[PDB]
Amino acid sequence: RTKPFTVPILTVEEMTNSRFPIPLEKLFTGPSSAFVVQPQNGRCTTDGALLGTTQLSPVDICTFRGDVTHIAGTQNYTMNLASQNWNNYDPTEEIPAPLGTPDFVGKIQGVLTQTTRRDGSTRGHKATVSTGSVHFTPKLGSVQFSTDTSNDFETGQNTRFTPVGVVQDGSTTHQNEPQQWVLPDYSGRDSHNVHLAPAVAPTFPGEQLLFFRSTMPGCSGYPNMNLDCLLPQEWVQHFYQESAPAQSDVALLRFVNPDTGRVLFECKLHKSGYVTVAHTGQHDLVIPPNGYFRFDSWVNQFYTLAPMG
């Protein structure tokens, strides 16, 4: 028959957040009609099509490579983006932004590094990229960093940003940023994002999205550190390898505790890449650390889940 569908046998803690390069920590559910769930990283159909700005590398998420140019009279640099392999980035490719581009509005702190080609000399400096900034225009091929130097980086040299965590301004409302559910303007002010992966939503009574949650490192302030993704990076990687044809609307998963051998809850993995559970309210799931997801069968949308604990 057709190639059988599967999800990785991996506990939540062995897996990686698909929207920022750190491990998953937990499963969280809550109502989502008050915000727009349209992330562009961590988007993949169950049969293996990548969507949005999603790519395979768990470490190249929220990274940037290119050449930098000082902005006279400031401590900021403009980076002209190059591709993941140092090729030119093409703005006309039909994606929202370079694959891996961050998909939330926030200030991401990380380190800008550079080797000088003629001698192998090296430099590294603290740098922030502000994704809601008017100069965040990855889709046009350009992004801007604020740093703690003014003369160190050289023009025409390979430069790389490594993300570390996020930042918020402490004299304003605690946890007011980042805003994990607002996409940046990939092309700047007054321009529409294009080729986005579809916003998603529960579409059955009783049901809520299930999120795979990490905590972002915080570098300064009182940032909102929560980061929910719709698929672990390892699942994206798996669906891409397997390419199993979806046989109905939903793949029914069981989350099992191997110590008791008992199913703890079931959920729906929709064909176009996210999960729902039967629950009303915000809930941090309590799970055994060695619990894992296993595919059960392909069922219709109208399948009724047993209430999640």
Ligand X SMILES: CC(=O)N[C@H]1[C@@H](O[C@H]2[C@@H](O)[C@@H](CO)O[C@@H](O)[C@@H]2O[C@@H]2O[C@@H](C)[C@@H](O)[C@@H](O)[C@@H]2O)O[C@H](CO)[C@H](O)[C@@H]1O
Binding mask 180-219 for ligand X (x = CB under 6 A): ----------------------------------------
37 is an interface residue for a second copy by CB under 8 A:
no
Extract the tokens encoding 100: 């891996």
Under the binding rule (CB under 8 A), the answer on residue 48 touching a second copy is: no
**Interatomic CA distance for residues 244 and 4, integer angstroms:** 6
Beta carbon nearer to a second copy, 120 or 205: 120
Q: Which is nearer to ligand X, 177 or 228 (CB)?
A: 177
* CA 187/CA 199 separation, integer angstroms: 19
Q: Nearest Cα to 32, choosing from 258, 195, 199, 268?
A: 199
- Binding-site partner at residue 31 among a second copy, ligand X, none, CB < 5 to 8 Å by type: none
- State how far Cα 179 lies from the chain centre: 13
Q: How many CA atoms lie within 13 A of 7 on its CB side?
A: 32
Stretch that binds a second copy, among 16-24, 90-98, 137-145, 188-196 (CB under 8 A): 16-24
Minimum CB separation of residue 15 from a second copy in Å reads 8
Q: Where are the alpha helices (DSSP H) in 62-195?
A: none
Under the binding rule (CB under 8 A), the answer on residue 149 touching a second copy is no
Residue 22 interface partner, choices ligand X, a second copy, none, CB cut-off 5-8 Å depending on type = a second copy
Residues 6+ apart with CB under 8 A from 213: 24, 25, 26, 27, 28, 226, 227, 228, 229
* 142-147 and 76-81 beta bridge pairing: antiparallel
Q: Is 150 in the site for ligand X (CB under 6 A)?
A: no
| Residue 119 touches a second copy, criterion: CB under 8 A | yes
Which residues make up the interface to ligand X (CB under 6 A)? 121-123, 125, 152, 167, 170, 220-221
- What residue numbers does the annotated binding site for Zn(2+) cover? 70, 117, 119, 125, 148, 154, 238, 242
